[PDB]
Write a protein that binds this ligand. Sequence first.
Ligand SMILES: CCOC(=O)CP(=O)(O)[C@H](CC(C)C)NC(=O)[C@@H](NC(=O)[C@@H](NC(=O)CC(C)C)C(C)C)C(C)C
Ligand SMILES: *[C@H]1O[C@H](CO)[C@@H](O)[C@H](O)[C@@H]1O
Ligand SMILES: *[C@@H]1OC[C@H](O)[C@@H](O)[C@@H]1O
Length: 323
Amino acid sequence: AASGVATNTPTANDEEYITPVTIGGTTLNLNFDTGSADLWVFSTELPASQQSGHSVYNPSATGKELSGYTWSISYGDGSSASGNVFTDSVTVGGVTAHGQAVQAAQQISAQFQQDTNNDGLLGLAFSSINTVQPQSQTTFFDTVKSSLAQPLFAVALKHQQPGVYDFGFIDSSKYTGSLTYTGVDNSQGFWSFNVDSYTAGSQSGDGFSGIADTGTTLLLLDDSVVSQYYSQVSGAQQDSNAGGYVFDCSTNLPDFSVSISGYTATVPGSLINYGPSGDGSTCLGGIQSNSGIGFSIFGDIFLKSQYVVFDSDGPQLGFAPQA
Ligand SMILES: CCOC(=O)CP(=O)(O)[C@H](CC(C)C)NC(=O)[C@@H](NC(=O)[C@@H](NC(=O)CC(C)C)C(C)C)C(C)C
Ligand SMILES: *[C@H]1O[C@H](CO)[C@@H](O)[C@H](O)[C@@H]1O
Ligand SMILES: *[C@@H]1OC[C@H](O)[C@@H](O)[C@@H]1O
């Protein structure tokens, strides 16, 4: 049975988490994203000036082209990428996927052209939303899951410290106590789950659903919950330059918790201070609006407090506080 550990590392302010992946002999630094299902990489098919500052994949060296296949993806912050497809060997923490579909970028939007922290994305949402056309492909996880000791992966993302992605096994030393599991609705291809209630500092409210998404920096909630949270933070104000609600960095923030199948997942107010707003002397809050989409995004701010198991059997999600 195969299992492996890949180490992730946060970039500045934990804006994103990158982990090395070897593709056809070359190691690239990718952003592992449980919110999408495409494995796409910077490649030699991009303009030479955009390859600058990246580790790039060269398909001709080792990949097998899928003639006529293309991919095109667009994300929630408006960024996008597109290209063609090859199959190659992909290794993550010593687990190798032979014949994994690798999406070689031919075009990338400015957001990606500006980010030299990563060389592409490894999607870990359900393969049902993979964008490859005319026939969709399986994520790295779906490709290897029958070979793992257990068909699951787990994640510990940390604040300014290296974390891990465990594939095929659960590391009990990464959390306190026992895991609590909840059912996943994979109908829109996400690791979607329900919360029965929430408490934002001194205010509590009714439940909602959200997705566990390693690829999103913040915890994005309904405007109503955002308002209630910041109404308790002295002097909090929106700052379009910073990207949402900001406050004096020294402010004492209330905690935020959700009740999931009887387990209280709590994000301590210190994790809600994301960092310098990069606009004067204030800090950006880790809780911001989901722009009215109807469901919450449990991004890195939330994940930094938990050890999370993504189990294909059910499917289900297990939660426990990070040790
Ligand atoms: C399948 C569709 O699902 C999604 O698109 C959500 P994802 O997690 O796949 C995507 C990955 C990102 C790398 C584009 N993340 C996103 O699109 C989210 N983008 C973000 O969280 C961006 N982070 C920031 O802007 C940091 C700033 C908030 C202080 C990226 C640079 C990490 C938006 C939801 C705010
Ligand atoms: C993950 O689990 C596998 C299967 O037991 C081990 O062989 C591997 O060393 C790692 O513990
Ligand atoms: C990244 O890979 C393997 C180990 O578990 C971890 O300690 C390392 O930093």
